[PDB]
């Protein structure tokens, strides 16, 4: 056991997300329904997360404790303690960069204020109602100017080249990567030396503080948009067998299933060169799935299968009353107690 202190929090970079994860979860399958062993490489996977039963591989070639670092050649499961299946994380390759809800919809929209663009505008961008000019060259249009459908059409038709604009969360990420923190910070401090209006000054200070902290911490803005999505270890969203044949699963299994399905379908639709409208719908649905996954409660309320109650997303699982369910009230049942 380490002797630690100072717990550090920062945005996870995509290479770190790949770093923690041991394998990619490509197919939504969970278990074989005949023999309830986990399917590879599904949401429950022994070769990725861990061996089901202590010190025994899936296919059953290696069963002795003497084998502990060998990795079964047929089934790519390493022979180790089943408890490891509680900590190993997975990851999913998302085809279309999707926005992180927490950094968008929270009353102060930090993407918005970093981009000094109101929330409604960004909403219009992600849902594919209008484009945004990402470096619109030597033209009569600014760098954060929105163009409507047929304004983008008249511009493209007239301006074929020297004009870079896009739609959706990938557009947002692209334009976000390009912003020069240092120069904009210098501009804002020059405003502070020259600008004298109470509320404008106040807002300016706010923006300045955000930029300063962001550039000091070492977080790069483009990470606010997620490319790789980590998947929680299986044991924390278990699929335990109830007695009598019936099964119980946490909702996260369903949410992950939905995300993987829509991601795979988008992959296929892209490979087929499908019409734009349908790919756009696909990106909308994927955004929806992700937003249910990260923080359920900021949208159209995706109910679960046949249960009427909204399914509980990660954010709900963390925040409770009060907050930490088992760490905070209430409250860690204890042994050696009577009443």
């Amino acid at each position: 056991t380490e002797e630690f202190d100072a717990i550090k929090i920062a945005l996870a970079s995509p290479d770190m997300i790949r770093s923690w994860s041991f394998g990619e979860v490509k197919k939504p399958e969970t278990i074989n329904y005949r023999t309830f062993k986990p399917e590879r490489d599904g949401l429950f996977c022994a070769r990725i997360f861990g061996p089901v039963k202590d010190y025994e591989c899936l296919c059953g070639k290696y069963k002795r404790l003497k084998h502990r670092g060998v990795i079964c050649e047929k089934c790519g499961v390493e022979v180790t303690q089943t408890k490891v299946r509680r900590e190993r994380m997975g990851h999913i390759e998302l085809a279309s960069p999707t926005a992180h809800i927490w950094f968008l919809k929270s009353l102060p929209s930090r993407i918005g204020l970093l981009l000094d663009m109101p929330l409604r505008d960004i909403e219009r961008v992600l849902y594919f109602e209008s484009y945004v000019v990402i470096e619109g060259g030597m033209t009569n249009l600014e760098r954060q100017q929105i163009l409507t459908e047929e304004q983008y059409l008249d511009a493209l038709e007239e301006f074929g080249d020297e004009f870079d604009a896009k739609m959706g969360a990938e557009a947002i990420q692209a334009l976000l990567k390009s912003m020069d923190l240092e120069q904009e910070c210098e501009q804002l401090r020059e405003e502070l030396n020259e600008t004298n209006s109470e509320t404008k000054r106040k807002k300016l200070t706010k923006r300045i503080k955000l930029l300063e902290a962001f550039v000091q911490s070492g977080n790069k803005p483009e990470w606010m948009i997620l490319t790789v999505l980590p998947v929680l270890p299986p044991d924390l969203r278990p699929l335990v067998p109830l007695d009598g044949g019936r099964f119980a699963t946490s909702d996260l299994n369903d949410l992950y299933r939905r995300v993987i399905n829509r991601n795979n379908r988008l992959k296929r639709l892209l490979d087929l060169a499908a019409p734009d409208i349908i790919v756009r719908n696909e990106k909308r649905m994927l955004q929806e799935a992700v937003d249910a996954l990260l923080d359920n409660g900021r949208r159209g309320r995706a109910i679960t299968g046949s249960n009427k109650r909204p399914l509980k997303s990660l954010a709900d699982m963390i925040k409770g009353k009060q907050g930490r369910f088992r760490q905070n009230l209430l409250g860690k049942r204890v042994d050696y107690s009577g009443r």
Partner: protein, 49 residues
Amino acid sequence: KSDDVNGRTKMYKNIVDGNHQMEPGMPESFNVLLKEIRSLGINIELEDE
């Protein structure tokens, strides 16, 4: 008493042996918390100095 697996088993053995020591470890709920927050795009690591 509740969430530390190794601690609870070691303390069972200690009590049976007639010794009274302790070995707290990390509460399992906190480990779950780390994994659950890490499931988001939030990096939470235990630093060292």
